[PDB]
Design a protein around this ligand. Structure first.
Ligand SMILES: [Mn+2]
Ligand SMILES: [Mn+2]
Ligand SMILES: [Mn+2]
Ligand SMILES: [Mn+2]
Lengths: 267, 271
């Protein structure tokens, strides 16, 4: 069990050496904007992971991309952008790439079934690329918002369909799980999809909006959630997603305190 | 005088053939072809429409693709694909002898909530590129006001102005969507303000709702006062098409009769 930060906290050099001066076991680089996995950023990150020693997880680009689009060119562009992230991950010796499910476009709200086919198509094409590069894709459960796919474990199954691959699993977002139901009841079901939970996002909210609050500032029972993870022997990374560095560091300590309280129970 | 039209989506996602043969037997002055899915302006579709536009003496307006595209995107490739797709529509329009291509304002994604100014700049760049393409083809862009939805641009006239900025072009005006306006305010009061952007109102979408969702009901089923809207459109001398956007033909056809009836009444107000 290792703790990380999403660089989502702004430019890269501006955010990186400031994160590095703390004690996070892993960095989650989100492949967007100025943090994009360009050659320059790969080389910069490659040298940073040598001065220090940390694990890297990469978050694929997601913004203004729809894996589930009826527009074929939008789908093709989505695989192309996610290919950049997988390649960077490969170069970075990273082993996990986080990917978002798509959404139902307004024009095609009555054709949810065929929208799901689209997302499946794109995801297969992407998992195929992950297989070439020995990279695992963690499909991420989404916050409860109108039109978005993969809110529920059941809807995640409908995108995953019959994909049988040692390279497809789940990124468990605890915060998103709270907008849809009880975050502890997601663990069993998500672990039963593909290779199961291979990455975790940690943040808090009040069960309605994706607020990304500091741990404790919402109503998620994290103690209970850590229990379900320790139950399934989750050795991966718990990555923190907050609005600023200090809240993330406060989240770090608080969650490492709950891990203390968890492990002593097994006596 | 104002012409009445129907949008091709009253039949999406049917073939363009079945859609239009079904549309053809009703008596619309214009057809609005939305350049999406099976109705996309492909060589086969453009050639079919040309033949069909020679049998029926009708006017064609085209709606550019909008869906899953974002002209305001931080992602340059998404931005570029958006112009490529709109280029297709402008090119199809030109071959179809259309005067007007309808175009959508962009969207602010959650990730870039704190980049509004930069996002509008993006939408301005896209528009510039698209207007320039339009100028080469003798095509007019009708930038469409949007429904009242978090993150979407061009809901109000002043947000539309933030996309247009200083573009000085005989080829940029507004597509006035009445139903969208109703989700944001009084539809009749949009007319004056939209008429002041670029070359003014060059196309109109007519459909009804109860003031919150883009329901696309048939005229009368919501709470829009269409006499007022038509009254204000008359005052500005609007003589373009009024395009009905409904979910089915029967709604579209009855909307046509009700609006024609309302326009008759507006002419009586001139006493
Ligand atoms: Mn995510
Ligand atoms: Mn989130
Ligand atoms: Mn439209
Ligand atoms: Mn609409």
């Amino acid at each position: 069990m290792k703790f990380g930060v999403s660089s989502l906290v702004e430019s890269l050099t501006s955010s990186m050496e400031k994160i590095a001066e703390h004690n996070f076991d892993a960095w989650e680089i989100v492949c967007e904007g100025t943090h994009y996995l360009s050659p320059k950023n790969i080389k910069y990150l490659m040298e940073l992971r040598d001065r220090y020693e940390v694990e890297i997880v990469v978050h694929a680009p997601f913004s203004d991309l729809n894996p589930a689009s009826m527009n074929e060119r939008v789908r093709k562009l989505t695989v192309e952008c996610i290919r950049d992230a997988i390649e960077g991950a490969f170069e970075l010796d990273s082993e996990v790439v986080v990917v978002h499910p798509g959404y139902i476009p307004e024009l095609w709200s009555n054709y949810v079934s065929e929208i799901l086919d689209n997302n499946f198509s794109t995801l297969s094409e992407i998992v195929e690329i992950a297989e070439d590069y020995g990279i695992k894709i963690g499909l991420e459960n989404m916050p409860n918002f109108r039109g978005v796919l993969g809110i529920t474990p059941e809807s995640l199954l409908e995108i995953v369909k019959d994909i049988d691959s040692k390279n497809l699993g789940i990124t468990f977002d605890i915060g998103h799980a709270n907008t849809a139901g009880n975050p502890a009841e997601f663990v069993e079901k998500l672990q039963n999809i593909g290779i199961g939970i291979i990455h975790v996002h940690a943040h808090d909210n009040n069960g309605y909006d994706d607020e990304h609050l500091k741990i404790g500032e919402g109503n998620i029972n994290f103690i209970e959630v850590l229990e379900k993870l320790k139950e399934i022997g989750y050795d991966g990374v718990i990555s923190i997603e907050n609005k600023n560095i200090r809240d993330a560091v406060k989240s770090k300590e608080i969650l490492k305190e709950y891990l203390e309280i968890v492990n002593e129970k097994v006596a």
